[PDB]
Amino acid sequence: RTGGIGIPVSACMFTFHNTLGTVSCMDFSNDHKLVAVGTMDSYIRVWSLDGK
Amino acid sequence: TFDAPPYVITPEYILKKFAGHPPSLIVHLYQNHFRFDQQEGMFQYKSPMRIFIEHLRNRTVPHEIMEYLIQGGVPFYEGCLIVQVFDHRTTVPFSIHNHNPYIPTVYTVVLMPTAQALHTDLLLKTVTPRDHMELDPKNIYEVEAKILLATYPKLDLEPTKNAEETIAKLEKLAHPEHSHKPPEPKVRDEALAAEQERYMLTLDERLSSKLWEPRFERFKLIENIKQEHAEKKEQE
Amino acid sequence: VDSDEETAAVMSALANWNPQPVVPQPVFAPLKRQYQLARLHEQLQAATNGGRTNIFKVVGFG
Amino acid sequence: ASLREFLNKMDDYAPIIPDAVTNYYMTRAGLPPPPQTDIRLARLLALATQKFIADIAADAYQYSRIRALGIQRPGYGGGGQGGSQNRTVLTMEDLGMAVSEFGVNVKRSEFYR
Amino acid sequence: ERRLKGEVMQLPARDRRRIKELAHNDFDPYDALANVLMEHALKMNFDLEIRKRYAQPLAVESGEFPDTSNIESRMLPFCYEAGLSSGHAPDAAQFMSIATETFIKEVMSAIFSRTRSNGPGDSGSAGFGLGSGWIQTHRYRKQLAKEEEAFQRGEISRDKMGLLPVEAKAASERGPLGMADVRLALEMGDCGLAGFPVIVKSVIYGWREGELENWEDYTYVDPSRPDGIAIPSWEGAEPETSDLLNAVLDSCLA
Amino acid sequence: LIKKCRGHGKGGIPSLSFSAESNVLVSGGLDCTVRVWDIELPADPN
Amino acid sequence: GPKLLWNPENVRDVADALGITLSEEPLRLLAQDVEYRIGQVIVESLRFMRAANRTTLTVQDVSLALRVLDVEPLY
Amino acid sequence: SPRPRDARTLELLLTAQGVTSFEPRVSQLLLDFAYRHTAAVLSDALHLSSITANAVALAISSRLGYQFRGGGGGYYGGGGGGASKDWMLELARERNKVALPRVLPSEWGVRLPGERFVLSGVS
């Protein structure tokens, strides 16, 4: 690798609304099909990332 | 630069590499007590020094007396200790009627280092005057880091693609010192003669209590006092 | 009284705060180990005569 | 006095605590709400809470009444003009006196300087 | 950063001076660690008397509950450590032994009351009296009341220890106190051991009860089951003489 | 230490991730930014 | 001793509430200890705040910090 | 609006440590905690007695037996519960001496602990 610049990259952003600062941790599954959030209210919430 | 030890250290490698050198320690075992080669007294198997014997059973370095080993200049061979063991195990008392004219096997073993030994070494260096002390506590971690670099220069960093390869790697990298089974659960006529003997020992100050490790402390103290007094007299 | 200098000094002083204790914080361990180590030290001090005798010395080559 | 009969009579012993509060605090503690848990168990828990609060009220009312030299106890700063009329006022002093018997400390400073 | 200036200048000059004087503190040499580190790495010879504390076995070593004699043996070195050159009062060891028994009884009662039920009733001379008792179940209560009335009528007799048949039957089913009960009780409160963190940490960090006996006990993940779980239904070199040396050393250790 | 990368603000970088060939790094920060990092810059063509 | 961030006049007021008279040395000692305890609480609170990936400190974090230190809770 | 001193001071100290925001009722919580600690310590010191510095030190040492076993102490600093490091080292030595469990490829990811230690029949 002689000369040139870095590599272009695309990004997709997921945004969560009406959380009021109760969200402590977040994680994605290995195949980008599920998302899990742990909160300050002791419970976990899981969603399918495509709405099915 | 220094040579690093192998992944699994065995008595054969150490005893073959370090032939022709004097052993680190020599211990003589008797029926009820043991001693060292140049020691004058004795240690009973029921005494605190029993701990040392346990190390001899587990082929571990005895860190609990490490200071005493450093004071005496005991040699180390790649962090291990070579110990030679010599084995000699294999009428009418207190009666005025008695008459009187004036009336081994050899083994060699190797003890291997542990993590508690390194912790003890660093802790001792922290309090050993030479800056003031030999090692400043704030520099401890860095020093430790360097030591690790000299003990494990090579690691297994190649990745695996599936669980079968991880299983094979865990099988291949097993260590004898960490391959034991789980421990076991915790578990919980002469009468007339004994009664007569107890009755006949009534109001006895010392013999009654029993129903013995001599340390000669008083004689050593007297000898120290005599030496000090002789030294003081010699000055004048 | 310059306000910028005062603010810088106050914030720099507050950033490096490090209180000192009045008594040290205790460290806990079982009693059995303490008693055993005390006994071992007594025995070894008696054996070595306070450090005047080297009982671990080896003479010869084994 | 059986537990089965008491749980079967839970229709007549519902407390004044709304179901939403019960669900919120049960979830905070770790119990799924009455859709999956029996409604009667949740009602029983709320009734126990109401009984505990009523005990803590009956005391501190006793303390207020026996109180009716003469200076306040340090550590219970609160209040304003002191109310009006010959009415009974729930003050920090009486609540602290009462809850000290349950193992709770509620002491504060009166001024800050 | 223009609000910080206002916040700082709202403080009066005395507070600002006091805050600024913190810069004169000579940092943290933390030399006081040395003593702690040392802790880990005509006249009366009081050291000789003090060193007698380590010449007696501990209760855990001898298997004996401490009594007046042991406490008396322990007292004097403590007194000489603190500079109490006149010793202790003659009546202190008995007081200490009574206090120790009271403390142990309180701890054990607290542990027992959280894991047991259906104890003897207050019919006579047996039970918890005016102290704290256990819970009861409906069937046990019914049978106990029936038997108490029957005994009052003279149709029933107690055993040699004064228990009724229902009480004796309930008692016989109980077992010795195990570590699972202790672990459960410690999750409810301190049990009186707030000042002894080592005991608590020893309990928490240990093996589970029954874990070492059933080392190969396994269940499986099964989503088609009620709970998702399926239950299956040089001379003498070491390598050539290690065994002989081990035999000799085991004989020495006994 | 091979090197240091700078440019994020203060507060914390909770997440990092490598690419399939480990030649690029992606980081997410509490300053409301996502940044991409070259693990080895190309040789100077002169 | 060192320079103290906590003012001994607060300790003097507290001792006033209980009818106690203090000298200088015990007053300085108590002020130093109060300052050290405040520092400990702040350290634990910041630890809890950073465990949740946050830069805002709430009353819940301070309450958890007091709970972990074996302190009687405030209500 | 009025605001007591030591409150502005606590808030400035918090800001200097990297906190970008805090709720209004943290300063008064800290002030009341300080009040309670001072009252308890000196009430203890009163009984051991004019009060000297030795009585205050002894009261503090006595209180340190059942609380405040935390902080950010490092080398031989009584934090994280206050346990000695040698005791932890010997516990680790006892634990790490056992061989790692043997797992077949057909039970990797699916085998669970024994029936005694799982949540069966809990509903």
Q: How far is residue G71's CA from residue D105's CA, in Å, rounded to a whole number?
A: 11
DSSP H helical ranges for chain A:
none
What long-range pairs does E58-63 form, CB within 8 A, spacing at least 24? E58/C31, E58/C32, E58/C35, E60/C32, E61/C32
Cβ separation of C58 and B23 shorter than 8 Å? yes
What long-range pairs does E92-95 form, CB within 8 A, spacing at least 24? E93/E68, E93/E69, E94/E68
Q: Are strands A23-28 and B25-29 parallel, antiparallel or unpaired?
A: unpaired
Q: How far is residue E51's CA from residue D75's CA, in Å, rounded to a whole number?
A: 48
Cβ separation of F14 and G50 shorter than 8 Å? no
Comparing alpha-carbon positions, the chain A residue that sits nearest to D32 is A43
Backbone angles phi, psi at B191, to 5 degrees: -60, -45
Q: Nearest 5°: CA angle at B222, between B220 and B223?
A: 65
The residues, ordered by sequence, that sit 6+ positions from H9 with a Cβ below 8 Å of its Cβ are E11, E15, E19, G5
Q: Residue A47 has which token pair?
A: 């969603």
F27, F18 in Cβ contact below 8 A? Answer: no
In the block, residue with structure tokens 């006092």: B225
Q: How far is residue C21's CA from residue B143's CA, in Å, rounded to a whole number?
A: 28
Cβ separation of E58 and C35 shorter than 8 Å? yes
Q: What stretch of H or E contains B103?
A: none
Q: Is F12 on the interface with H (CB under 8 A)?
A: no
Q: How far is residue G26's CA from residue E77's CA, in Å, rounded to a whole number?
A: 30
Shortest Cα–Cα distance, C58 to chain H (Å): 31
B107, burial (CB in 10 Å: exposed 0-12, middle 13-18, buried 19+): buried
E221, H110 in Cβ contact below 8 A? Answer: yes
Q: E179: closest CA among E201, E203, E211?
A: E203
Task: Express the helix, strand and coil content of chain E in percent, nearest 5 each.
Answer: 55, 5, 45
D63, D97 in Cβ contact below 8 A? Answer: yes
**A23 bridge partner residues:** A39
D95, burial (CB in 10 Å: exposed 0-12, middle 13-18, buried 19+): buried
Backbone angles phi, psi at G9, to 5 degrees: -70, -30
E133, E119 in Cβ contact below 8 A? Answer: yes
In the block, residue with structure tokens 């009468």: B191
Chains C and B touch (3+ CB pairs under 8 A): yes
Q: Which residue in A19, A20, A22, A40 has the most chain G C-beta atoms within 10 A of its own C-beta, making it the best mutation to test that interface?
A: A40
Residue type present at position E165: P
Rg (CA), chain H: 25
D110, D77 in Cβ contact below 8 A? Answer: yes
Q: How far is residue H4's CA from residue G10's CA, in Å, rounded to a whole number?
A: 12
E111, E182 in Cβ contact below 8 A? Answer: yes
CA distances from E246 to B10, B42, B87, B110, E41 (A): 17, 22, 12, 13, 32
Residues comprising chain C, all counted: 62
CB atoms within 10 A of CB E241: 18
The residues, ordered by sequence, that sit 6+ positions from B149 with a Cβ below 8 Å of its Cβ are none
Number of H helices, E strands in chain B: 9, 5
Q: Which residue in D37, D76, D112, D113 has the most chain H C-beta atoms within 10 A of its own C-beta, making it the best mutation to test that interface?
A: D112
Shortest Cα–Cα distance, E63 to chain G (Å): 33
Q: Residue E169 has which token pair?
A: 């039957």
E87, E78 in Cβ contact below 8 A? Answer: no
**Which of E40, E248, E249 is closest, CB to CB, to B123?**
E40
Q: What stretch of H or E contains F38?
A: strand F33-38
B75, B22 in Cβ contact below 8 A? Answer: yes
E56, E74 in Cβ contact below 8 A? Answer: yes
Q: How far is residue E118's CA from residue E167's CA, in Å, rounded to a whole number?
A: 8
Q: How far is residue D105's CA from residue D96's CA, in Å, rounded to a whole number?
A: 7
The residues, ordered by sequence, that sit 6+ positions from B222 with a Cβ below 8 Å of its Cβ are none
CB atoms within 10 A of CB F29: 17
Task: Find the chain G residues whose C-beta atoms sit closer than 8 A to any C-beta of E.
Answer: 2-3, 5, 7, 70
Comparing alpha-carbon positions, the chain G residue that sits nearest to F11 is G55
Q: H8: closest CA among G40, G28, C14?
A: C14
**Which of B119, B167, B174 is closest, CB to CB, to H103?**
B167
CA distances from G68 to B172, G45, G63, H40 (A): 43, 10, 9, 19
Cβ separation of B89 and E248 shorter than 8 Å? yes
Backbone angles phi, psi at A46, to 5 degrees: -120, 140
The residues, ordered by sequence, that sit 6+ positions from H20 with a Cβ below 8 Å of its Cβ are F11, G55, G56
H36 in the Ramachandran plot: left (φ > 0), alpha (ψ -120 to 50) or beta?
Answer: alpha
Q: With b meaning 16 or more CB within 10 Å and e meaning fewer, what string describes B4-32?
A: ebeeebebeebbeebeeeebbbbbbbbee
For residue D65, how far is the Cα from the chain centroid?
18
Q: How far is residue D20's CA from residue E204's CA, in Å, rounded to a whole number?
A: 37
Chains G and A touch (3+ CB pairs under 8 A): yes
3-class secondary structure, H117: helix
Q: Is E242 on the interface with B (CB under 8 A)?
A: yes
Q: Are strands F33-38 and G56-57 parallel, antiparallel or unpaired?
A: unpaired
Q: Nearest 5°: CA angle at H46, between H45 and H52?
A: 65
E115, E184 in Cβ contact below 8 A? Answer: yes
B114, B60 in Cβ contact below 8 A? Answer: yes
Q: Is B137 on the interface with H (CB under 8 A)?
A: yes
Q: How far is residue C27's CA from residue D87's CA, in Å, rounded to a whole number?
A: 56
Shortest Cα–Cα distance, G16 to chain E (Å): 23
CB atoms within 10 A of CB B87: 19
DSSP H helical ranges for B84-213:
115-126, 140-151, 163-172, 190-200, 207-210
In the block, residue with structure tokens 């000799």: E248
Cβ separation of G32 and C17 shorter than 8 Å? no
Q: How far is residue E107's CA from residue E191's CA, in Å, rounded to a whole number?
A: 6
Residue type present at position E7: E
| Chain E environment of B127 (Cβ under 8 Å) | 34, 37-38, 41
Query: Which chains contact F through at least 3 pairs of Cβ atoms less than 8 Å apart?
Result: A, G, H
| Chain F environment of H20 (Cβ under 8 Å) | 11
E181, E113 in Cβ contact below 8 A? Answer: no
The residues, ordered by sequence, that sit 6+ positions from A34 with a Cβ below 8 Å of its Cβ are A28, A46, A47, A48, A49
| Chain H environment of D112 (Cβ under 8 Å) | 4-7, 31
H76 in the Ramachandran plot: left (φ > 0), alpha (ψ -120 to 50) or beta?
Answer: left
Half-sphere exposure for E236 (CA within 13 Å, toward CB): 19
**B111 bridge partner residues:** B81
Number of H helices, E strands in chain E: 12, 2
Q: Is F30 on the interface with G (CB under 8 A)?
A: yes
| Chain C environment of G38 (Cβ under 8 Å) | 19
G64, burial (CB in 10 Å: exposed 0-12, middle 13-18, buried 19+): middle
E151, E162 in Cβ contact below 8 A? Answer: no
Q: How far is residue E167's CA from residue E171's CA, in Å, rounded to a whole number?
A: 6
Number of H helices, E strands in chain G: 3, 1
3-class secondary structure, H51: coil
| Chain B environment of E251 (Cβ under 8 Å) | 89
Comparing alpha-carbon positions, the chain H residue that sits nearest to F31 is H20
**Which of H13, H64, H71 is closest, CB to CB, to C26?**
H64
| Chain H environment of C23 (Cβ under 8 Å) | 57, 60-61, 64
Rg (CA), chain C: 28
Residue type present at position B212: W
Q: How far is residue E216's CA from residue H2's CA, in Å, rounded to a whole number?
A: 69
Q: What stretch of H or E contains H95?
A: helix H85-95
CB atoms within 10 A of CB G34: 25
Cβ separation of H98 and B170 shorter than 8 Å? no
Q: What stretch of H or E contains B221?
A: helix B217-235
Q: What secondary structure does DSSP assign to D17-42, as a single string?
A: S-HHHHHHHHHHHT---TTTS-HHHH
Angle between helices E68-81 and E92-113 (to 10 degrees): 110
Q: What stretch of H or E contains D73?
A: none
H63, E177 in Cβ contact below 8 A? Answer: no
DSSP letter for B176, please: G
Cβ separation of E238 and B110 shorter than 8 Å? yes
In the block, residue with structure tokens 């049978």: E143
H14, H22 in Cβ contact below 8 A? Answer: yes
Cβ separation of F24 and A7 shorter than 8 Å? yes
In the block, residue with structure tokens 């930014």: F33
Q: How far is residue F38's CA from residue F21's CA, in Å, rounded to a whole number?
A: 12
In the block, residue with structure tokens 């119990």: D31
Residues comprising chain E, all counted: 254
